[PDB]
């Protein structure tokens with residue numbers, strides 16, 4: 001793998017920018033923290049810029065194609081991604097071939113504009129078994145990782161609660177509190193720009 005991490009200084013505005021987006025986009029969930037745990041804030045341990053030429057070229061190339069298919073606009077968004085496969089993703093890239101076939105929006109790659117949403121998917125679907133060490137979805141000890149990714153949404157189909165994008169579309173926007181999820185069915189419509197290492201913070 002030709003993938004490379006840049007540790008960002010916490011005084012670095014680029015860090016603070018992602019730091020802020022992460023903290024500010026937290027919300028009260030339907031769950032009551034059953035999936036991602038109980039917290040109002042994160043402990044932000046490490047933000048690393050992911051650098052990989054093969055993956056950057058794969059993305060921009062697709063981004064161009066999509067623009068041409070969508071009135072010369074990529075419809076590019078910074079979105080959080082949670083999943084068990086973050087360590088794989090930063091090396092091999094996002095890969096649709098590992099999508100969960102029984103998602104509410106079919107076999108795609110789910111993003112969110114709310115850190116606290118993506119957080120839910122970190123230890124699997126609906127938080128899964130929780131952390132590997134304590135089997136606790138609300139673990140304040142075990143360090144978690146999210147991705148803050150450049151995502152090419154293109155022309156996004158609006159759905160509510162499938163295998164590819166609907167015809168003439170590049171992404172799906174859902175809203176099942178209604179919060180926004182986003183789905184792609186092609187790994188190269190997303191680049192994982194920042195690797196965020198963090199804990200959820202116990203409130204009091």
Ligand SMILES: CCOc1ccc(-c2nnc([C@H]3C[C@H](NC(=O)c4ccc5ncccc5n4)C3)n2-c2ccccc2F)nc1
Pocket residue numbers: 082083084085088089092093094095096098099100103104108109110111121124125126187
């Ligand atoms: C309420 C149900 O809601 C959701 C929300 C999000 C997702 C989701 N979104 N993305 C994923 C992951 C599959 C995709 N995986 C990769 O890009 C990838 C890339 C390289 C890999 N290499 C080795 C092994 C696995 C690898 N996986 C990201 N997943 C995902 C897929 C399978 C299991 C868990 C997941 F979160 N699925 C369902």
Ligand SMILES: [Zn+2]
Pocket residue numbers: 131132133134135136139140141142
């Ligand atoms: Zn734990």
